[PDB]
């Protein structure tokens, strides 16, 4: 298998079982000696998968309204950059059907339900399919792997029928999640130093690369 900045200490426990495993662990955080707290290989893998999925959702979300605005498809009042759409009211705000703090409570309640159910699945596997939950507990039984629950709800199309195909799709998901996390970091830091939309950054760079660049922006 290919290796990327592998080390003798890292290779003692990264044998390639996990998806997207290249032996990269210079700091040795996944060292399975004295595991505890939040420093644990299984929890770290689960956190990486979850963060990658959320960044994949967020990477396209922060750019989707922007590119259609320059394309003349949606009204210009809704084609705002991610940092002005109301996330930071000092940076700009937009009036929705309810005030931002009211939306925050509803979002917190719904996400609390979802994340508490997920966490309780993680702590004691197979628990969510026992107690009556509007009759929806039949499909929320999980599959024994916390990061890949499957089932009729989370796997409607029935993808990954073949084990090798499932392995390949898991590898693609991991790679795309890492790329999305890098893209999100780029989003944040580019917005910090330029103050304009990332799509505008790309358009400015394509206008000319020698005048709109790191050497000219910093």
């Amino acid at each position: 298998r290919p290796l990327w900045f592998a080390s003798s200490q890292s290779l003692s426990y990264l044998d390639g079982s996990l998806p997207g495993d290249y032996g990269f662990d210079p700091l040795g955080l996944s060292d399975p000696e004295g595991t505890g707290g939040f420093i644990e290989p299984r929890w770290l893998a689960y956190g990486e998968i979850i963060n990658g999925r959320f960044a994949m959702l967020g990477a396209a979300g922060a750019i989707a309204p922007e590119i259609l605005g320059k394309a003349g498809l949606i009204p210009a009042e809704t084609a705002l950059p991610w940092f002005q759409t109301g996330v930071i009211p000092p940076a700009g705000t937009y009036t929705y059907w309810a005030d931002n703090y009211t939306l925050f409570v509803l979002e917190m309640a719904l996400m609390g339900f979802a994340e508490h159910r997920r966490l309780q699945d993680w702590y004691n596997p197979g628990s969510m399919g026992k107690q009556y939950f509007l009759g929806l507990e039949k499909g929320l039984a999980g599959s024994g792997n916390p990061a890949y629950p499957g089932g009729p709800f989370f796997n409607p199309l029935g993808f990954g029928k073949d084990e090798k195909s499932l392995k390949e799709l898991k590898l693609k998901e991991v790679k795309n999640g890492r790329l999305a996390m890098l893209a999100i970091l780029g989003y944040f830091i580019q917005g910090l130093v330029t103050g304009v939309g990332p799509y505008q950054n790309l358009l400015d760079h394509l206008a000319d690369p020698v005048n709109n660049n790191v050497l000219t922006s910093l």
Binding site: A98, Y101, T102, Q120, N124, S127, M128, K130, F133
Partner: protein, 201 residues
């Protein structure tokens, strides 16, 4: 053991075995680990529930009718500042004496059950209850719905307990709403229904 729990997937405390009505295994701090505290807390919860239901009715029904104009009763917040036929301390003393006689016999039944079930004046009259907290008898249970199979009793007591908890929450909410918004509880509901998006804290 298979009853629904407040926190699905968790393990209920040992001292809560689901025998009591309205039992969902919610006791994070273990305030009723020993049985005596369990009995005392059950009695306190029952009393709080009934008082709260009476208070919720007396707060919300009068205020609803005043808004629509059938009656012209004052606000429940300021109902204590009106002038009545006598000084308020006299009414407080009368209340203290009467409720001291009433609650005094209730204290004895908790400590020593089955000792205050007889009429002091006319011995022919007795209370028919057998459980602490449910006195029974013709005085308190005239319709006779308080005795029967254990399933019926458990269902009825669970209904009473849950309704009492809801009433406690509603009364606390009304008090804090009047503290903060400075307006009647019914007005708050109409304001919320007018603009649900923005009529908020």
């Amino acid at each position: 053991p298979d009853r629904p729990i407040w926190f699905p997937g968790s393990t209920p405390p040992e001292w809560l075995d689901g025998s009591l009505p309205g039992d969902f295994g919610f006791d994070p701090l273990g305030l009723s680990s020993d049985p005596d505290s369990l009995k005392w807390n059950v009695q306190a919860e029952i009393v709080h529930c009934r008082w709260a239901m009476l208070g919720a009715a007396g707060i919300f029904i009068p205020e609803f009718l005043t808004k629509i104009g059938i009656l012209n009763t004052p606000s429940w917040y300021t109902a204590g500042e009106q002038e009545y036929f006598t000084d308020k301390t006299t009414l407080f003393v009368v209340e203290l004496i009467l409720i001291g006689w009433a609650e005094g016999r209730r204290w004895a039944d908790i400590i020593k059950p089955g000792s205050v079930n007889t009429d002091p004046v006319f011995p022919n009259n007795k209370l028919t209850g057998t459980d602490v907290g449910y006195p029974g008898g013709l005085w308190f249970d005239p319709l006779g719905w308080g005795s029967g199979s254990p399933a019926k009793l458990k269902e009825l007591r669970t209904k009473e307990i849950k309704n009492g908890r809801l009433a406690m929450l509603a009364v606390m909410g009304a008090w804090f709403q009047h503290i903060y918004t400075g307006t009647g509880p019914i007005d708050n509901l109409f304001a919320h229904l007018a603009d649900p998006g923005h009529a908020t804290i």
